[PDB]
Design a protein around this nucleic acid. Structure first.
Lengths: 128, 94, 28, 59, 662, 60, 101
RNA sequence: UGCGAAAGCAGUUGAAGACAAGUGGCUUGUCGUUCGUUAAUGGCCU
């Protein structure tokens, strides 16, 4: 349906950002896997999603990161072999954009502990 | 699992006594060392469950592409009535 | 949602036979 | 000896062997030095096996 | 349509382990290879193949044995001027001498003491040692003529079983036993110490298990005995003084078989740890000091080596080895470590075990004493016949229309009516005592009822009666190798047959008049024969891998330019084409196959121009398509005008000699 | 019939039954005795291959 | 500690991959069935992590074929899920008493 | 390779000559050759 519209648009020649938008429109998990299973080659979906997740490594939408993790689950026998000239610095800047969350997961878990302590002692001292 | 429910309640309720104590880390060192060694390896098992779950759902979706096929694939047989028509001494007999 | 984004990003950081009978074709 | 790759001398110092690099490949020559008792030479392809020519350069 | 290909792996026809290799003639380096040299391979299911090492090892004849029969040792005997004679022990109390013509035992001499463990032949080949389980060494007088064997003398007894034998000359007999010792008896008749054991030697025993001396040879250039035992150690013993010169700790487990060359400059040895060791004495200092060195070591076999032998002549110097893995391996004698080697295919089907019929899309296949039938669809096993009144099987044929099967061995044959009852068959014997009494090699079905039978005693019947067959000139190779003038092949369809005997004689026969009209016209052993009804032609292919065709009522112009316009694949071919047929959609194209490839030659086209027995020794006298992507090949055929049947093989504990880990 | 087919097969195939104090052996046929060498002694064949597959050489 | 020290000696010394090369279903089940127990402890879990990572790196096809180590990988997944909940909540207690200095 | 913190941040990967194989050239690959660039079943002692 709309997954087929996004498939045809992303397969023809153009409209890759609008293609990921149309993929984010219906946005099924099963159809998300099916759109990776159907196509036989990509027009540097890894490159455009690399620049999107590089420019927003902190977005509340799970759509493009879900698409990236299923692309890397199902097609990484070929993403390491499609291209290795711009794709090398692509994975480099993606890996350096994403390592900071591994750097700051402990402070966020610490602040989560802080806030749970504060809210639970405030629920405790509730003035009878 | 069960006992750290006790340790979070001791900090919440007695939040004044052990902030007025002068050496918190020196007085409950064993808690600090236990939690440091429990939470120090968190990136390692993050990488472990990423790498594990990736292969797990990889074979799960590849086997869910054909999960109905192995329910009636086994059509195996055995030494059927060709063995009875085969036993030529038992064909002279019966 | 920050710990969720951080967990997924860190996952991305650390993420960076013969049958018994066939049927095939050959040249005439 | 006009091109030497490797060399060794016996324990008594009575003779010495060395390598040549004289063409398709190298060569191996032994010579007694305190007398003309013996001096022989041969290409080392007759030393080497037939397996080694289709194997790595370490062989 | 394009060619749709049924790559079948249903037939699990598996041969058995090579247990004994022997060469018919001894070595004689400075004379030409004789035209009568045959290698003999006794397996462990009881069949004896006989191969000829001319032009990459074709297989002349096969002598099958039946249920629960094996063969442990075999020796040749050729007194100069008389026929070859082949004796063999099984796991029993008899020696069995075979006549090479029929492929049957012509003598079962029960040796008069116990179960035979080893056999050896005297030098000058008038006596035969059998070394038995009760510690006896029995001499059998061989020189009475081919067939007649007499008991001669039981040598002085002992406790433990003698597992290997050798002779020094006509004089002494050496024997390695299962108590770790090596005895030396004197078989010199008309001496005072005839038959009594002169010496005993004891090898270095294993610490935690019993030691068995498995292989013993005599080395005539020096005066030693080489001996391999079950510790892996290989020892060389001075014969006079009966004592060890030097021991090597070579293998990691037992040394089952060891052999030597002509002038005893090398000793090769092999066993269950699956490496072949070479011990050399070729240096002038080695020969003047009597000092073998452990020269080299090769890993070529997969599981074991149970048999090793060596041949060395003016245009042939190879050692041949085989073991638990069923394949043969050829290496060079004087160039063992340096030179190359050839691992033979595990089966080259010169005698087939599979054929198909195009109606019902069905295929029959017979292993030892059972036949099986399945149909294409997938595929479905429709019937089988594990006839156990039988003991040994041989060749088989089905009627066109798929009605009656006939199975046939050299003792009898039997014919079974078949009726497809749906998802099964019904099979019934139809009695004919002429068939039940006749010996059959080949049955090939003139009609739906008429078959032609080639008997093992050179008779050609036509049943359901007698073809006149002219005689062949008996020359020296025909009297030496006594099966050369025996009918190998016969091919027939529609009342016109052609037979083929391996002297280079291929004779047509009209089934009406039953007269020969010979077209012998050949130079060596004939690999396959197929009749082309188009062109009115016979198509022979010989062991040299040349395709001749001739007409009927000499070779055509297509043969005359094809033979020397033949492709480079055929000119560098290693496995002989064992089967030819013709295409089904076109009556003029022909489609043939060896054991590792499939080719097809075109009837009219011609293409433009621009470790063997290799000497000047004679033979046994005195659009083009090529593929090999179905190389472990057993049988191919056709079904209808677009599909093909390619039935092949597919695969045991072994001594782990591990590859380097990284 | 499933639990005694090998019984009736062997009891119809085998010979040399007892008759009181006696035992009535069949003599064999020149057919088999001249078409084939006799069977291997399974005792000694098992001894040789059991030796070559003893536990002390670690096969795999 | 003896299983841990031979794992660590094979890790430091040579190759995990050399120690794991010739394996199949029946000869990997001891390793993974111990890795279930070793993933709970702090002292073993780094070694258990890299050994499980290498064995799923070089046996990803046996994952597809054999179903009777798929379930072992699933049980290992739920084990690492419990352990990662524990290693997260320990960091939360660490922060909530870092607040009390 | 350089700067670095253990993270990372910038840079890549030319030329000549000889030889080998394949089909005097052409292709491919090597080098106990030069110039430039910051760049073989073969395992451990008593």
């Amino acid at each position: 349906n709309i997954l087929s519209s996004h498939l045809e648009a992303n397969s023809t020649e153009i409209l890759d950002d609008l293609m990921s938008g149309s993929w984010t429109e219906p946005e099924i998990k099963k159809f998300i896997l099916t759109k990776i299973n159907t196509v036989d080659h990509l027009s540097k979906i890894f490159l455009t999603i690399s620049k999107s997740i590089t420019q927003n490594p902190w977005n509340e939408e799970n759509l493009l990161p879900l698409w990236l993790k299923w692309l890397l689950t199902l097609k990484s026998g070929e993403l390491n072999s499609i291209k290795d000239k711009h794709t090398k610095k692509n994975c480099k800047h993606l890996k350096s954009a994403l390592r900071s969350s591994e750097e700051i997961l402990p402070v966020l878990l610490g602040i989560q502990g802080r806030l749970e302590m504060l809210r639970r002692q405030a629920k405790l001292r509730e003035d009878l | 699992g069960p006992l750290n429910v006790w340790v979070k309640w001791c900090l919440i309720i007695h939040g004044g006594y052990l902030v007025s104590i002068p050496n918190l880390m020196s007085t409950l060192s064993s808690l600090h060392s236990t939690l440091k060694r429990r939470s120090d390896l968190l990136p390692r098992l993050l990488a472990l469950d990423a790498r594990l779950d990736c292969t797990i759902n990889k074979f799960k979706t590849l086997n869910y592409e054909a999960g109905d096929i192995h329910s009636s694939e086994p059509v195996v047989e055995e030494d059927e009535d060709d063995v009875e028509y085969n036993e030529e001494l038992d064909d002279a007999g019966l | 949602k920050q710990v969720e984004i951080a967990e997924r990003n860190t996952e991305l950081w650390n993420l960076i036979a013969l049958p018994t009978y066939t049927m095939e074709y050959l040249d005439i | 000896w006009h091109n030497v790759i490797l060399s060794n001398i016996s324990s008594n110092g009575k003779l010495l062997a060395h390598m040549c690099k004289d063409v398709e490949h190298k060569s191996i020559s032994v010579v007694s030095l305190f007398d003309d008792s013996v001096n022989l030479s041969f290409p080392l392809g007759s030393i080497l096996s037939s397996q080694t020519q289709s194997l790595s350069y370490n062989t | 349509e394009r060619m749709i290909v049924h790559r079948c792996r249903f037939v699990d026809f598996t041969p058995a382990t090579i247990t004994s290799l022997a060469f018919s003639h001894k070595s004689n380096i400075n004379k030409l290879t004789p035209s009568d040299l045959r290698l003999a391979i006794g397996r462990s299911n009881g069949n004896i193949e006989i191969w000829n090492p001319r032009n990459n090892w074709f297989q002349e004849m096969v002598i099958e044995g039946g249920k629960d029969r094996s063969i442990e040792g075999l020796c040749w005997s050729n007194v100069n001027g008389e026929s070859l004679r082949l004796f063999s022990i099984g796991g029993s109390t008899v020696v069995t001498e075979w006549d090479l013509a029929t492929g049957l035992p012509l003598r079962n001499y029960d040796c008069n003491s116990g179960v035979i463990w080893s056999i050896s032949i005297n030098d000058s080949q008038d006596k035969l040692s059998v070394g038995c389980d009760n510690g006896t060494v029995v001499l059998i007088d061989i020189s009475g003529g081919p067939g007649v064997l007499e008991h001669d003398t039981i040598l002085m007894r002992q406790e433990a079983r003698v597992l290997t034998l050798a002779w020094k000359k006509d004089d002494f007999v050496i024997g390695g036993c299962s108590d770790g010792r090596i005895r030396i008896w004197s078989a010199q008749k008309n001496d005072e110490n005839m038959g009594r054991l002169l010496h005993t030697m004891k090898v270095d025993k294993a610490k935690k298990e019993s030691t068995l001396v498995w292989s013993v040879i005599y080395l005539p250039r020096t005066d030693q005995i080489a001996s391999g035992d079950s510790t892996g150690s290989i020892k060389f013993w001075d014969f006079q003084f009966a004592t060890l010169n030097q021991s090597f700790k070579a293998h990691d487990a037992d040394v089952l078989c060891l052999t030597t060359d002509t002038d005893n400059n090398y000793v090769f040895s092999a066993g269950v740890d699956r490496k072949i060791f070479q011990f050399s004495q070729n240096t002038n200092k080695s020969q003047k000091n009597n000092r073998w060195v452990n020269s080299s070591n090769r890993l070529l076999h997969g599981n074991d080596i149970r048999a090793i032998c060596a041949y060395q002549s003016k245009g042939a110097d190879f050692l041949v080895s085989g073991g638990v893995e069923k394949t043969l391996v050829i290496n060079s004698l004087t160039s063992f470590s340096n030179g190359n080697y050839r691992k033979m295919p595990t089966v080259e089907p010169y005698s087939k075990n599979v054929l198909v019929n195009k109606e019902q899309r069905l295929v029959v296949s017979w292993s030892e004493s059972t036949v099986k039938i399945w149909t294409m669809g997938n595929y479905k096993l429709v019937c089988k016949l594990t006839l156990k009144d039988d003991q040994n099987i041989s060749t088989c044929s089905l009627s066109p229309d798929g009605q009656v099967l006939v199975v046939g061995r050299p003792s009898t044959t039997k014919v079974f009516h078949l009726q497809p009852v749906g998802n099964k068959l019904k099979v019934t014997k139809l009695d004919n005592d002429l068939l039940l009494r006749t010996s059959t090699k080949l049955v090939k079905f003139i009609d739906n009822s008429k078959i032609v039978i080639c008997s093992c005693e050179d008779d050609v019947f036509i049943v359901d009666q007698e073809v006149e067959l002219l005689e062949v000139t008996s020359t020296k190779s025909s009297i030496k190798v006594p099966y050369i003038n025996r009918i190998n092949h016969l091919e027939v369809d529609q009342n016109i047959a052609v037979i083929s005997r391996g002297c280079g004689v291929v004779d047509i026969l009209d089934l009406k008049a039953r007269i020969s009209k010979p077209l012998a016209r050949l130079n060596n052993f004939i690999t396959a024969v197929h009749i082309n009804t188009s062109r009115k032609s016979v198509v022979v292919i010989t062991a040299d891998n040349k395709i001749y065709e001739f007409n009927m009522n000499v070779l055509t112009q297509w043969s005359k330019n094809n033979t020397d316009n033949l492709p480079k694949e055929w000119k560098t071919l290693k496995e002989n084409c064992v089967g030819i047929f013709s295409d089904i959609e076109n009556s003029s194209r022909l489609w043939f196959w060896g054991a590792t490839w499939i080719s097809r030659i075109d009837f009219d086209v011609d293409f433009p121009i621009n470790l063997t027995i290799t000497d000047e020794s004679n033979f046994m006298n005195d659009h083009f398509f090529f593929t090999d992507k179905y190389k472990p090949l057993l049988f191919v055929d056709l079904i209808s005008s677009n599909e093909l049947a390619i039935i092949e093989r597919n695969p045991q504990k072994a001594f782990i000699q591990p590859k380097l880990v990284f | 019939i499933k639990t005694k087919k090998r019984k009736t097969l062997k009891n119809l195939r085998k010979d040399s039954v007892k008759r009181g104090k006696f035992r009535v052996q069949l003599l064999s046929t020149t057919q088999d005795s001249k078409t084939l060498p006799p069977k291997k002694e399974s005792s000694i064949i098992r001894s040789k291959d059991r030796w070559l597959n003893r536990k002390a050489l670690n096969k795999g | 500690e003896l299983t841990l020290t031979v794992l660590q000696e094979l890790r430091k010394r040579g190759k995990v991959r050399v120690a794991l090369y010739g394996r199949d279903e029946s000869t990997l089940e001891p390793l993974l069935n111990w890795c279930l127990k070793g993933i709970e402890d702090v002292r073993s879990a780094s070694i258990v992590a890299d050994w499980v990572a290498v064995v799923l790196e070089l046996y990803g096809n046996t994952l597809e074929s054999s179903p009777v180590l798929q379930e072992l990988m699933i049980d290992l997944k739920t084990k690492v899920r419990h352990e990662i909940h524990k290693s997260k909540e320990a960091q939360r207690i660490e922060g909530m008493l870092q607040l009390l200095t």
